[PDB]
Amino acid sequence: VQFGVMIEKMTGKSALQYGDYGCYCGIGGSHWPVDQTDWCCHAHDCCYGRLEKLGCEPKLEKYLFSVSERGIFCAGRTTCQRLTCECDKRAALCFRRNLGTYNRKYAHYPNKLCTGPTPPC
Ligand SMILES: Cc1c(C(=O)C(N)=O)c2c(OCC(=O)O)cccc2n1Cc1ccccc1C(F)(F)F
Ligand SMILES: [Ca+2]
Ligand SMILES: [Cl-]
Ligand SMILES: [Cl-]
Ligand SMILES: [Cl-]
Ligand SMILES: [Cl-]
Ligand SMILES: [Cl-]
Ligand code: NA
């Protein structure tokens, strides 16, 4: 809900249009990212991994945020909530920054088409 809301506010698209994009947007991921938007998702997965290693549960954490002219402001009772917001913010900004190359053909991309090596974090 929260990340999805952040995606919608920052990109003008439905959350669903990122949730299953390329080889990395959506649960898990493998092989080489298809484009810059997909790289945002690779980085976001790495970000969540770092949070998991710190003892957080970023897949489950609920946080608070606002969007003004100054940008995305993150908040939350716990440090783990705020960290999760920071990973999400970076991803949502990355999506916005790459709207110019977003390609509808990579939404709901068949995972069978993901080829090549898996880049490290
Ligand atoms: C873009 C994205 C994700 C990523 O950024 C990613 N790197 O995989 C993502 C996600 O990533 C965490 C993971 O890969 O384990 C899990 C579920 C939905 C996700 N979505 C889509 C999403 C996000 C919030 C609310 C709804 C949706 C959905 F799936 F409906 F589109
Ligand atoms: Ca992923
Ligand atoms: Cl690329
Ligand atoms: Cl990151
Ligand atoms: Cl707001
Ligand atoms: Cl910002
Ligand atoms: Cl397009
Ligand atoms: Na703390």
JSON list of C-alpha atoms and ligand atoms in Angstrom, two decimals:
[
{"chain": "A", "resi": 1, "resn": "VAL", "atom": "CA", "xyz": [0.00, 0.00, 0.00]},
{"chain": "A", "resi": 2, "resn": "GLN", "atom": "CA", "xyz": [2.57, 2.60, 1.14]},
{"chain": "A", "resi": 3, "resn": "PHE", "atom": "CA", "xyz": [5.22, 1.92, -1.58]},
{"chain": "A", "resi": 4, "resn": "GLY", "atom": "CA", "xyz": [2.41, 1.71, -4.14]},
{"chain": "A", "resi": 5, "resn": "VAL", "atom": "CA", "xyz": [1.07, 5.04, -3.00]},
{"chain": "A", "resi": 6, "resn": "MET", "atom": "CA", "xyz": [4.58, 6.49, -3.22]},
{"chain": "A", "resi": 7, "resn": "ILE", "atom": "CA", "xyz": [4.96, 5.11, -6.75]},
{"chain": "A", "resi": 8, "resn": "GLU", "atom": "CA", "xyz": [1.64, 6.66, -7.86]},
{"chain": "A", "resi": 9, "resn": "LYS", "atom": "CA", "xyz": [2.44, 10.08, -6.37]},
{"chain": "A", "resi": 10, "resn": "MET", "atom": "CA", "xyz": [5.92, 10.20, -7.90]},
{"chain": "A", "resi": 11, "resn": "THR", "atom": "CA", "xyz": [5.29, 8.69, -11.39]},
{"chain": "A", "resi": 12, "resn": "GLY", "atom": "CA", "xyz": [1.67, 9.46, -12.38]},
{"chain": "A", "resi": 13, "resn": "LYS", "atom": "CA", "xyz": [1.23, 5.72, -13.11]},
{"chain": "A", "resi": 14, "resn": "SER", "atom": "CA", "xyz": [-0.65, 3.06, -11.27]},
{"chain": "A", "resi": 15, "resn": "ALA", "atom": "CA", "xyz": [1.47, 1.00, -8.81]},
{"chain": "A", "resi": 16, "resn": "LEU", "atom": "CA", "xyz": [0.50, -2.09, -10.85]},
{"chain": "A", "resi": 17, "resn": "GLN", "atom": "CA", "xyz": [2.58, -0.77, -13.80]},
{"chain": "A", "resi": 18, "resn": "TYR", "atom": "CA", "xyz": [5.77, -1.15, -11.78]},
{"chain": "A", "resi": 19, "resn": "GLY", "atom": "CA", "xyz": [4.84, -4.21, -9.76]},
{"chain": "A", "resi": 20, "resn": "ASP", "atom": "CA", "xyz": [5.59, -6.65, -12.46]},
{"chain": "A", "resi": 21, "resn": "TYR", "atom": "CA", "xyz": [8.10, -4.86, -14.70]},
{"chain": "A", "resi": 22, "resn": "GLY", "atom": "CA", "xyz": [11.24, -6.24, -16.34]},
{"chain": "A", "resi": 23, "resn": "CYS", "atom": "CA", "xyz": [13.29, -8.84, -14.47]},
{"chain": "A", "resi": 24, "resn": "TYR", "atom": "CA", "xyz": [13.51, -7.15, -11.02]},
{"chain": "A", "resi": 25, "resn": "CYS", "atom": "CA", "xyz": [10.31, -5.17, -10.28]},
{"chain": "A", "resi": 26, "resn": "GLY", "atom": "CA", "xyz": [8.11, -7.43, -8.16]},
{"chain": "A", "resi": 27, "resn": "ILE", "atom": "CA", "xyz": [9.10, -10.30, -5.88]},
{"chain": "A", "resi": 28, "resn": "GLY", "atom": "CA", "xyz": [12.68, -11.57, -6.37]},
{"chain": "A", "resi": 29, "resn": "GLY", "atom": "CA", "xyz": [14.53, -11.26, -9.64]},
{"chain": "A", "resi": 30, "resn": "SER", "atom": "CA", "xyz": [17.38, -12.71, -11.63]},
{"chain": "A", "resi": 31, "resn": "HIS", "atom": "CA", "xyz": [19.48, -12.18, -14.75]},
{"chain": "A", "resi": 32, "resn": "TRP", "atom": "CA", "xyz": [20.30, -8.82, -16.33]},
{"chain": "A", "resi": 33, "resn": "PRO", "atom": "CA", "xyz": [17.97, -5.80, -15.82]},
{"chain": "A", "resi": 34, "resn": "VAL", "atom": "CA", "xyz": [16.13, -4.82, -18.99]},
{"chain": "A", "resi": 35, "resn": "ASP", "atom": "CA", "xyz": [16.46, -1.03, -18.66]},
{"chain": "A", "resi": 36, "resn": "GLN", "atom": "CA", "xyz": [17.05, 1.84, -16.19]},
{"chain": "A", "resi": 37, "resn": "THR", "atom": "CA", "xyz": [13.62, 1.39, -14.51]},
{"chain": "A", "resi": 38, "resn": "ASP", "atom": "CA", "xyz": [14.47, -2.28, -13.93]},
{"chain": "A", "resi": 39, "resn": "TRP", "atom": "CA", "xyz": [17.84, -1.26, -12.45]},
{"chain": "A", "resi": 40, "resn": "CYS", "atom": "CA", "xyz": [15.84, 0.87, -9.94]},
{"chain": "A", "resi": 41, "resn": "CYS", "atom": "CA", "xyz": [14.20, -2.39, -8.86]},
{"chain": "A", "resi": 42, "resn": "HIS", "atom": "CA", "xyz": [17.50, -4.30, -8.69]},
{"chain": "A", "resi": 43, "resn": "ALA", "atom": "CA", "xyz": [18.85, -1.54, -6.38]},
{"chain": "A", "resi": 44, "resn": "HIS", "atom": "CA", "xyz": [15.62, -1.59, -4.32]},
{"chain": "A", "resi": 45, "resn": "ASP", "atom": "CA", "xyz": [15.97, -5.37, -3.81]},
{"chain": "A", "resi": 46, "resn": "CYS", "atom": "CA", "xyz": [19.56, -4.80, -2.67]},
{"chain": "A", "resi": 47, "resn": "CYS", "atom": "CA", "xyz": [18.32, -2.03, -0.35]},
{"chain": "A", "resi": 48, "resn": "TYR", "atom": "CA", "xyz": [15.79, -4.38, 1.28]},
{"chain": "A", "resi": 49, "resn": "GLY", "atom": "CA", "xyz": [18.56, -7.00, 1.63]},
{"chain": "A", "resi": 50, "resn": "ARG", "atom": "CA", "xyz": [20.67, -4.50, 3.58]},
{"chain": "A", "resi": 51, "resn": "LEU", "atom": "CA", "xyz": [17.69, -3.75, 5.83]},
{"chain": "A", "resi": 52, "resn": "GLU", "atom": "CA", "xyz": [17.11, -7.47, 6.45]},
{"chain": "A", "resi": 53, "resn": "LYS", "atom": "CA", "xyz": [20.77, -7.81, 7.50]},
{"chain": "A", "resi": 54, "resn": "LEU", "atom": "CA", "xyz": [20.20, -4.95, 10.03]},
{"chain": "A", "resi": 55, "resn": "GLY", "atom": "CA", "xyz": [17.32, -6.91, 11.64]},
{"chain": "A", "resi": 56, "resn": "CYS", "atom": "CA", "xyz": [14.48, -5.14, 9.83]},
{"chain": "A", "resi": 57, "resn": "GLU", "atom": "CA", "xyz": [11.56, -6.72, 7.97]},
{"chain": "A", "resi": 58, "resn": "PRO", "atom": "CA", "xyz": [11.19, -4.25, 5.07]},
{"chain": "A", "resi": 59, "resn": "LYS", "atom": "CA", "xyz": [8.62, -6.39, 3.23]},
{"chain": "A", "resi": 60, "resn": "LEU", "atom": "CA", "xyz": [6.33, -5.93, 6.23]},
{"chain": "A", "resi": 61, "resn": "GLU", "atom": "CA", "xyz": [7.32, -2.54, 7.69]},
{"chain": "A", "resi": 62, "resn": "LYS", "atom": "CA", "xyz": [4.66, 0.20, 7.69]},
{"chain": "A", "resi": 63, "resn": "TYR", "atom": "CA", "xyz": [5.87, 3.82, 7.56]},
{"chain": "A", "resi": 64, "resn": "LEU", "atom": "CA", "xyz": [4.61, 7.39, 7.11]},
{"chain": "A", "resi": 65, "resn": "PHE", "atom": "CA", "xyz": [5.41, 9.83, 4.39]},
{"chain": "A", "resi": 66, "resn": "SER", "atom": "CA", "xyz": [4.42, 13.05, 2.73]},
{"chain": "A", "resi": 67, "resn": "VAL", "atom": "CA", "xyz": [5.18, 14.58, -0.65]},
{"chain": "A", "resi": 68, "resn": "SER", "atom": "CA", "xyz": [5.59, 18.35, -0.95]},
{"chain": "A", "resi": 69, "resn": "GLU", "atom": "CA", "xyz": [7.56, 20.67, -3.26]},
{"chain": "A", "resi": 70, "resn": "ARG", "atom": "CA", "xyz": [10.68, 19.94, -1.13]},
{"chain": "A", "resi": 71, "resn": "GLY", "atom": "CA", "xyz": [10.34, 16.21, -1.91]},
{"chain": "A", "resi": 72, "resn": "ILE", "atom": "CA", "xyz": [9.51, 13.01, -0.04]},
{"chain": "A", "resi": 73, "resn": "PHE", "atom": "CA", "xyz": [9.65, 13.24, 3.73]},
{"chain": "A", "resi": 74, "resn": "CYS", "atom": "CA", "xyz": [9.93, 9.90, 5.54]},
{"chain": "A", "resi": 75, "resn": "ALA", "atom": "CA", "xyz": [8.74, 9.15, 9.09]},
{"chain": "A", "resi": 76, "resn": "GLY", "atom": "CA", "xyz": [7.92, 6.34, 11.46]},
{"chain": "A", "resi": 77, "resn": "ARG", "atom": "CA", "xyz": [8.05, 5.28, 15.08]},
{"chain": "A", "resi": 78, "resn": "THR", "atom": "CA", "xyz": [10.99, 2.92, 14.48]},
{"chain": "A", "resi": 79, "resn": "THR", "atom": "CA", "xyz": [14.31, 3.19, 12.69]},
{"chain": "A", "resi": 80, "resn": "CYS", "atom": "CA", "xyz": [13.40, 0.12, 10.58]},
{"chain": "A", "resi": 81, "resn": "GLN", "atom": "CA", "xyz": [10.22, 1.88, 9.37]},
{"chain": "A", "resi": 82, "resn": "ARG", "atom": "CA", "xyz": [12.23, 4.97, 8.45]},
{"chain": "A", "resi": 83, "resn": "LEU", "atom": "CA", "xyz": [14.89, 2.83, 6.66]},
{"chain": "A", "resi": 84, "resn": "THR", "atom": "CA", "xyz": [12.20, 1.08, 4.64]},
{"chain": "A", "resi": 85, "resn": "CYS", "atom": "CA", "xyz": [10.80, 4.50, 3.65]},
{"chain": "A", "resi": 86, "resn": "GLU", "atom": "CA", "xyz": [14.31, 5.57, 2.54]},
{"chain": "A", "resi": 87, "resn": "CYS", "atom": "CA", "xyz": [14.73, 2.49, 0.29]},
{"chain": "A", "resi": 88, "resn": "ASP", "atom": "CA", "xyz": [11.26, 3.09, -1.19]},
{"chain": "A", "resi": 89, "resn": "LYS", "atom": "CA", "xyz": [11.93, 6.84, -1.68]},
{"chain": "A", "resi": 90, "resn": "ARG", "atom": "CA", "xyz": [15.14, 6.15, -3.55]},
{"chain": "A", "resi": 91, "resn": "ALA", "atom": "CA", "xyz": [13.31, 3.65, -5.79]},
{"chain": "A", "resi": 92, "resn": "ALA", "atom": "CA", "xyz": [10.35, 5.95, -6.41]},
{"chain": "A", "resi": 93, "resn": "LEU", "atom": "CA", "xyz": [12.69, 8.85, -7.29]},
{"chain": "A", "resi": 94, "resn": "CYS", "atom": "CA", "xyz": [14.59, 6.50, -9.56]},
{"chain": "A", "resi": 95, "resn": "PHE", "atom": "CA", "xyz": [11.34, 5.53, -11.32]},
{"chain": "A", "resi": 96, "resn": "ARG", "atom": "CA", "xyz": [10.45, 9.21, -11.81]},
{"chain": "A", "resi": 97, "resn": "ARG", "atom": "CA", "xyz": [13.95, 10.07, -13.07]},
{"chain": "A", "resi": 98, "resn": "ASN", "atom": "CA", "xyz": [13.65, 7.28, -15.69]},
{"chain": "A", "resi": 99, "resn": "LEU", "atom": "CA", "xyz": [10.09, 7.98, -16.96]},
{"chain": "A", "resi": 100, "resn": "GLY", "atom": "CA", "xyz": [11.66, 8.94, -20.31]},
{"chain": "A", "resi": 101, "resn": "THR", "atom": "CA", "xyz": [12.66, 5.30, -21.00]},
{"chain": "A", "resi": 102, "resn": "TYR", "atom": "CA", "xyz": [9.79, 3.48, -19.24]},
{"chain": "A", "resi": 103, "resn": "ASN", "atom": "CA", "xyz": [8.47, 1.03, -21.86]},
{"chain": "A", "resi": 104, "resn": "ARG", "atom": "CA", "xyz": [5.00, -0.53, -21.60]},
{"chain": "A", "resi": 105, "resn": "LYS", "atom": "CA", "xyz": [6.33, -3.67, -23.32]},
{"chain": "A", "resi": 106, "resn": "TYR", "atom": "CA", "xyz": [8.32, -4.49, -20.12]},
{"chain": "A", "resi": 107, "resn": "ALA", "atom": "CA", "xyz": [5.27, -4.41, -17.88]},
{"chain": "A", "resi": 108, "resn": "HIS", "atom": "CA", "xyz": [4.28, -8.05, -17.07]},
{"chain": "A", "resi": 109, "resn": "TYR", "atom": "CA", "xyz": [7.46, -9.22, -18.68]},
{"chain": "A", "resi": 110, "resn": "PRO", "atom": "CA", "xyz": [7.64, -13.04, -19.08]},
{"chain": "A", "resi": 111, "resn": "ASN", "atom": "CA", "xyz": [10.36, -14.11, -16.68]},
{"chain": "A", "resi": 112, "resn": "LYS", "atom": "CA", "xyz": [11.55, -16.70, -19.21]},
{"chain": "A", "resi": 113, "resn": "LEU", "atom": "CA", "xyz": [12.89, -13.75, -21.26]},
{"chain": "A", "resi": 114, "resn": "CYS", "atom": "CA", "xyz": [15.28, -12.76, -18.46]},
{"chain": "A", "resi": 115, "resn": "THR", "atom": "CA", "xyz": [18.76, -13.80, -19.63]},
{"chain": "A", "resi": 116, "resn": "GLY", "atom": "CA", "xyz": [22.41, -13.19, -18.85]},
{"chain": "A", "resi": 117, "resn": "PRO", "atom": "CA", "xyz": [24.25, -12.87, -15.56]},
{"chain": "A", "resi": 118, "resn": "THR", "atom": "CA", "xyz": [22.82, -11.53, -12.28]},
{"chain": "A", "resi": 119, "resn": "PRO", "atom": "CA", "xyz": [24.57, -8.28, -11.34]},
{"chain": "A", "resi": 120, "resn": "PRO", "atom": "CA", "xyz": [25.77, -8.12, -7.71]},
{"chain": "A", "resi": 121, "resn": "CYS", "atom": "CA", "xyz": [24.50, -5.47, -5.29]},
{"chain": "B", "resi": 1, "resn": "LIG", "atom": "C1", "xyz": [7.88, -1.95, -7.72]},
{"chain": "B", "resi": 1, "resn": "LIG", "atom": "C2", "xyz": [7.65, -3.11, -6.74]},
{"chain": "B", "resi": 1, "resn": "LIG", "atom": "C3", "xyz": [8.62, -3.75, -6.08]},
{"chain": "B", "resi": 1, "resn": "LIG", "atom": "C4", "xyz": [9.94, -3.41, -6.20]},
{"chain": "B", "resi": 1, "resn": "LIG", "atom": "O1", "xyz": [10.34, -2.25, -6.13]},
{"chain": "B", "resi": 1, "resn": "LIG", "atom": "C5", "xyz": [11.01, -4.48, -6.50]},
{"chain": "B", "resi": 1, "resn": "LIG", "atom": "N1", "xyz": [12.25, -4.00, -6.56]},
{"chain": "B", "resi": 1, "resn": "LIG", "atom": "O2", "xyz": [10.74, -5.66, -6.64]},
{"chain": "B", "resi": 1, "resn": "LIG", "atom": "C6", "xyz": [8.02, -4.71, -5.31]},
{"chain": "B", "resi": 1, "resn": "LIG", "atom": "C7", "xyz": [8.43, -5.67, -4.42]},
{"chain": "B", "resi": 1, "resn": "LIG", "atom": "O3", "xyz": [9.77, -5.79, -4.15]},
{"chain": "B", "resi": 1, "resn": "LIG", "atom": "C8", "xyz": [10.26, -6.50, -2.97]},
{"chain": "B", "resi": 1, "resn": "LIG", "atom": "C9", "xyz": [10.86, -7.82, -3.47]},
{"chain": "B", "resi": 1, "resn": "LIG", "atom": "O4", "xyz": [11.29, -7.87, -4.65]},
{"chain": "B", "resi": 1, "resn": "LIG", "atom": "O5", "xyz": [10.93, -8.76, -2.64]},
{"chain": "B", "resi": 1, "resn": "LIG", "atom": "C10", "xyz": [7.49, -6.53, -3.80]},
{"chain": "B", "resi": 1, "resn": "LIG", "atom": "C11", "xyz": [6.14, -6.40, -4.07]},
{"chain": "B", "resi": 1, "resn": "LIG", "atom": "C12", "xyz": [5.77, -5.41, -4.97]},
{"chain": "B", "resi": 1, "resn": "LIG", "atom": "C13", "xyz": [6.68, -4.60, -5.56]},
{"chain": "B", "resi": 1, "resn": "LIG", "atom": "N2", "xyz": [6.45, -3.61, -6.42]},
{"chain": "B", "resi": 1, "resn": "LIG", "atom": "C14", "xyz": [5.02, -3.26, -6.91]},
{"chain": "B", "resi": 1, "resn": "LIG", "atom": "C15", "xyz": [4.05, -2.83, -5.97]},
{"chain": "B", "resi": 1, "resn": "LIG", "atom": "C16", "xyz": [4.52, -2.03, -4.94]},
{"chain": "B", "resi": 1, "resn": "LIG", "atom": "C17", "xyz": [3.67, -1.56, -3.96]},
{"chain": "B", "resi": 1, "resn": "LIG", "atom": "C18", "xyz": [2.32, -1.87, -3.99]},
{"chain": "B", "resi": 1, "resn": "LIG", "atom": "C19", "xyz": [1.82, -2.66, -5.01]},
{"chain": "B", "resi": 1, "resn": "LIG", "atom": "C20", "xyz": [2.65, -3.17, -6.03]},
{"chain": "B", "resi": 1, "resn": "LIG", "atom": "C21", "xyz": [2.03, -4.00, -7.04]},
{"chain": "B", "resi": 1, "resn": "LIG", "atom": "F1", "xyz": [2.54, -5.29, -6.98]},
{"chain": "B", "resi": 1, "resn": "LIG", "atom": "F2", "xyz": [0.68, -4.11, -6.88]},
{"chain": "B", "resi": 1, "resn": "LIG", "atom": "F3", "xyz": [2.20, -3.52, -8.20]},
{"chain": "B", "resi": 2, "resn": "CA", "atom": "CA", "xyz": [12.42, -7.64, -7.13]},
{"chain": "B", "resi": 3, "resn": "CL", "atom": "CL", "xyz": [19.87, 0.00, -18.97]},
{"chain": "B", "resi": 4, "resn": "CL", "atom": "CL", "xyz": [19.22, 1.61, -2.88]},
{"chain": "B", "resi": 5, "resn": "CL", "atom": "CL", "xyz": [1.15, 13.57, 1.36]},
{"chain": "B", "resi": 6, "resn": "CL", "atom": "CL", "xyz": [12.83, 13.90, -2.27]},
{"chain": "B", "resi": 7, "resn": "CL", "atom": "CL", "xyz": [5.72, 2.81, -23.78]},
{"chain": "B", "resi": 8, "resn": "NA", "atom": "NA", "xyz": [17.07, 2.50, 16.71]}
]
